[model samples]
Target: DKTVRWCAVSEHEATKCQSFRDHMKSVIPSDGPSVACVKKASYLDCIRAIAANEADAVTLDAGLVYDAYLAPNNLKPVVAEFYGSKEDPQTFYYAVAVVKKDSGFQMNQLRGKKSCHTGLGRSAGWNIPIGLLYCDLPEPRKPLEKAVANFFSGSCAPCADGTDFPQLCQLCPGCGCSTLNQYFGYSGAFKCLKDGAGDVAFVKHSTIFENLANKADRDQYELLCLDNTRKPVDEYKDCHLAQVPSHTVVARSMGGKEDLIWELLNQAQEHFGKDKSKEFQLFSSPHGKDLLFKDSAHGFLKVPPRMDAKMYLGYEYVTAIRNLREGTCPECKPVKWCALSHHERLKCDEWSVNSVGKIECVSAETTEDCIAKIMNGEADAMSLDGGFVYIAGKCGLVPVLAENYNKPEAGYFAVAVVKKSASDLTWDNLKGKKSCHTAVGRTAGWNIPMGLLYNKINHCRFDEFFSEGCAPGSKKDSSLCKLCMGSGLNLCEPNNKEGYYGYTGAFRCLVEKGDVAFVKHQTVPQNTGGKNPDPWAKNLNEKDYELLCLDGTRKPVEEYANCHLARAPNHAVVTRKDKEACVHKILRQQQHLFGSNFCLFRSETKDLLFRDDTVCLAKLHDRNTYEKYLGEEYVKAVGNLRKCSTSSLLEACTFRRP
Candidate 1:
């Protein structure tokens, strides 16, 4: 036979559990799971016991439910307590700030008045009410408890005695943390307000009615609304501070006894529920209040199978709880940039120093590595090629900004460049010619041209079509990397460290060794005729190069508007969806303040972290997604091209979504 070990937080709860176990022995059938009680000193110890397999289950407050899912003990909620109507049951309650009628103080006038709270970290008492009153405390916000101590004159909040803020528990009649304290819980806090010890009490909407059943006594109080007005206690639907989720039963996510727990509770509630039996009551205890479950609970509801603890607690509730722990200063959170190489890391460090402590840097060896780092929250944002943008979008990242090139459109034209002397080497007769490309999986170098030639290279082996070539980010020992000029440790890398990488380097390969090059249209103008002060391209001329038209014709480099292979979208900044606004705001501020100290567009190696010809970073208003920015036709074109070869990262993310 199976036994369900229930974790109890207090000795009274253990006693209740033992009586319930003894009663279940007579009602439960043979071969069915029975009950066992596992007692611990605190609820946190119960959570640890459940994770360590010493206990099977425990009911937790909604605030502690988020803690169980956070770290050290990874548990999930399997059931929730419902206290509302049986016809339309709900798992939520409203938290309201109540004060005595005609105290003549509006919501804004209670700055230094005495207050009452149920407990220190309770949702309805502390998190919801404090978050509503959290206002202009100056820059670099302090801890929540310290601010609360300063905001109020004196309070009777239980379980807050050990902190340095002694004012938080000064109004209590007993040792202000345990059940011995007179002002410790919902009813107790209301008594503190009724006895003239507190000017206002922060409790649930039902506290006043539950403690004072007489209509005349309940009408003597009003709720402090968020709009700075005071209304009768019955109007809590519009005047409440927040809607807090109810408490839940939590267990280990893996190998949790969810089915057994649900079955045991289902039978317990049927046999010993409210008004069901006289011998034992599941929702009540004579020893103390809220022993194993909330004393006011009417029944239980099985949690939605797909909802974990964070999902069950909801986003706004979790964020409010987190804001109580971490100070509420958005500027204090630095944006960590993901850098691809040592050179990019150097530029990022300079940017960080100039950004005035709003930016930080994290480096990885490859662009794919940076994408993984951003997903794991080690970094925040990075500039990505349009090809990599699709992969990032597949992994649930969004585009924040696009690099502008001062052109008529937001993108650049991909063009094939050949020497003007090669009159016989038109697009029709270049079967076995040597070629140079910026790198694999690049917008202008790979996707635009290779996507256009999908029929010719259906098998997706570019090395077989060309006699020999220099394509960075390919096999280091393959014929594709044979013509690359990088030596020793820098051989055939995808980044700017390679000699035959990116737009300017690929054009340099064409001028020195290769017969033809594939790059963006501006590569010819940026590196020719004194435009480039570098050693290799300073003496070059634009007129010496001709663009190979896709229609079997040739034209000068300046005629790219008619001879280009395709117009591809520019590189963009990508980040997680939640970080879009922050990343965009920081980048917009950086360009205005530090655009001249170290030019983001100008670099010794072209396209270090951004394009060399970039004018500024521009926001994508409606095109904030990778699919929207890349366009429908371009996305489908790349999708079709990827049929022959796809990224391993894309495959891994696709399988991980499950």
Candidate 2:
């Protein structure tokens, strides 16, 4: 006998909700969660009511979905409205620019022209077209709303009050963001251009078809393509502003009764959907338009339960909406990539030129220094090793994009490398021996190998286990720096400027100084058998080195699949939560635009800005936060290894936020 309360915005909508409740009561089984209707003054009020638990659920457009998911009211979209047939449902639509035939204007000449829009903040009406036009300009370094208001001669953009920009509402008879104005929706925007009130109309691709009933009447208008040409209305697939997500039903993320809400809609749509019922229509109303669910929606589709508004709306639309809402626009600022050395700065400079002014360069001496700069807003983002990523996570930073490698997974394997002659140097008998590592706080260099040996030695004093070796970032006076070969004062440094640092440097140390070197699987193949033209590694052969298995045996370096210490996550670009969307957007566009001209992943040095072996930057859509991005097992391993020692930056970042 449980009940699910549905929220209604107006009197006519309330009446429609009551009819749906009554219809569900008569047909649904006695044990199912029944439907009950609740009334609110507006959509915003309904959102607040749901957050306070006064109502259970409400259907919202994709634009409002972004509002519901923000601070103070964390609502999740549980179900989506599909617009097409059951056999092939479509949960997306394309926005297009439409104008009357022989208007004599291309997309490049849209400046100073009259325009009509569905609403101020709608996907098809304002955000998509405005974003496209903003990018079209040479330097649109201003607020988006202000830029558009000045670009157009006049507009009938509903919901844009004359207070901020009066010219935007000059074409309307009575300016209003709500439905009180005639030119306030998809069909309304079409009517504005069709009746000669405006020169262009920004709306959905289907808007023209819905407004003009006669087939011949539709041919009077055409679509404005992005390539400075015109196309027939039917060619919207080739010429459109942006494709956006469908409308969805949102509820409180914590206790929204998602399962119960979905159960009611599933059974209700099956009985009274599209053409199913005539007595009481579930998706229709004779007295009002767009009551409860969209009148045009054919059915409902259940979304992934874990999907929030940011995930459901997608990165492109969410970033577009954010650019319009925020004061400091994202597009106006350049994404600053933190470079670790002078070698990396050169690569960053080349990338800046290749990617236009979108990417900028900032320099730091070390990885930790770069992390601190990103935290304080001095720098924007950078790719980090897993150990440094954990430290950055503790500093309130999050992973945005992961560097994908040559395999199916998003990571690589860590292994111990030694000469094939040292067959007795197995994992079981490595006490009081020389060792080499990429760096002190790296994945394969320190964390994975030390965590595996934590139980055997039962102590944090690692200097007592290894006699003499080159482990960069260690004490300059200890045995760890004895084998380091860097010239002058750069000796024992953790960066590539040192002679014994990183995967290749540590493997070079094994060839000349140590009993074993901890590095990734590809390190041997990338630097051996004439692959590396360096003076020291030019004549080395991959067959001369072997991998030490965890089972107290030695195997060829090619057998790391079954003889590795740990499979570590790949390096990822990290940034603040507020900057995550902008950073990812710029990086995605940069890689797609100029990756062929000059490779972003390749560098003059071993690795700079990003690893040379990286295939592409993958989106971390599902793994939003650091704890999720670095999984449970990896976090547990790092936590377990920290019992031996922790960095100063980690300690300082633990008891703080800023």
Candidate 3:
């Protein structure tokens, strides 16, 4: 009924395609659609073929996936290579910087060197390695392409500016290297390094392996570790330049038979995968090791149904490739910190002042609005609470760095704050008592406390227990808003208007009208002893407030640090997956220069930019994904809360997209 045409990018690919079609014809049931291998001499031709419906599918580097997305007709990646064991699939890979063992240069010393790149728009050759190279700059220079043009003394990078960056085109012996280039593809870049034309080679970890798969000298090369370290090329699993998403198989977006492609490959893999017979190896070829799928690939991972091209390629990798396309500026561009609200904008302005052009602290209105800015590329990054970080990561953002407030645990405790004189109050039996909350859905103020209560009480009638309260994000006319001061505006908004919207605000509510305040342990210390500059905090005293322990007794505010209800993870700075490296580069530089000296963290007003007590930042490093940084324990706790009943407002906050 249907015939799936696959494009072959090389001579070897064409040869293998023919073998694969023949093998598939024998393996498949007579009822299944037949496969036809279409040979194209160049990637552009393949793109044209896929666009014109002359072909149904083709495998491409992650960098080129961005190209397909930009094409006039849409294209999407439908399948990814599973390079690991069938028991545990690997969806990503590492791109490493390789140099001869005797090259005598470190990763940081890559400047002005003769470099080898796989090709212009491929992942390992260009995106990952370039991002790491330009990641840490003393200051901003030109865009990546031009800067890279000048950064390396001479290079064999294929497909770049011919005149201005002719040096990059030197090794590409092939003319108009859209596909066929002796020194322009993955193997070509390695050949440049191996032939002594370059001091260092930027490529996927497998370049050295696949090129020298059957050789003994494969161990002669080494990888440049990002930590100013170097190791044998075989050590890529541990020390590598950057871990990257794997290459994918793509097809036209409209009227494309994704299921048919999967069925064809899925059936063919059994006969052509690593375990395939010697007569034909679809993943490899005698002329070339990797014909279509890589030589080392074990099998394919069918992408979840209905995923888009951009969504499948992943946001960070997409951004990394786009950033590389612009140009190589060692210092890249100004770091745009997303800000929301008037005070936050003011604080961001102050931050930008300290950055002296390194940071562009832009402003937004709410967490949702700020996330929107990041999604649309208007802003670069933001610091968010665990709750908001959860939502941001779910919407395709990632955490690059986390805030560490000078604690070994690297976490803050949720607290139930009350007047030292409240003798009858306890954590257990405070039913029908008035309350103050930092904000609805925030980790310290809401999630942890509410999770604990619902687990203990078996229900989520938080409003009933706290007879009346000032919980920002609650319904305006609800009992939760009855005690809100509103400052001067609406009672249940996320800003200054809702007097109990944050740690400081909740403490303010407790000092004025509430029985207990739900906030972080830092809240009391920040407001007491006049540490807070706000005129309202002038009369607040540390000795006047105490934290209600799980037992009936209460302890002084300072004791809440370790002896409180729950210790939740600290707030983390999140960015568009695409800009994580750049944002990380700038923040690490800034924090080292100014994060602690009461420089970037200080304010004339209380808690403007970062938490008032925040001492410094911690490098997230390999923990780029939210699932990794947030940890399973935190995810389970939050998941448990939803298993019970979460506020409608909190649910909305959790589900809203960037």
Top-lDDT candidate index: 2
Q: Cα deviation of 241 in candidate 2 (Å)?
A: 36
Candidates ranked by TM-score = 1, 3, 2
Off by over 4 Å in 2: 1-332, 407-410, 644-646
Q: Name the lDDT value of residue 504 in candidate 2.
A: 87
After superposition, the stretches of candidate 1 with alpha carbons farther than 4 Å from their true spots are 1-332, 530-539, 596-606, 644-646
True-vs-predicted CA distance for residue 3, candidate 3, Å: 17
Summarize candidate 3's per-residue lDDT along 548-654 as a digit string, tens digits: 88876789888875458877778888886557778878887887887775377777666666766778777876677777887776666666666544443333323
lDDT of 2 by residue, 82-162 (tens): 888887787778788999889999888989999999988777988877766665433454645566778898889887766
lDDT of each: 0.79, 0.81, 0.74
Candidates ranked by lDDT, best first?
2, 1, 3
Reference-based TM-score of each model: 0.51, 0.50, 0.51
> Predicted candidate 3: what Cα RMSD to the true structure?
10.7
Tally clashing residue pairs in candidate 3: 9
TM-score of 1: 0.51
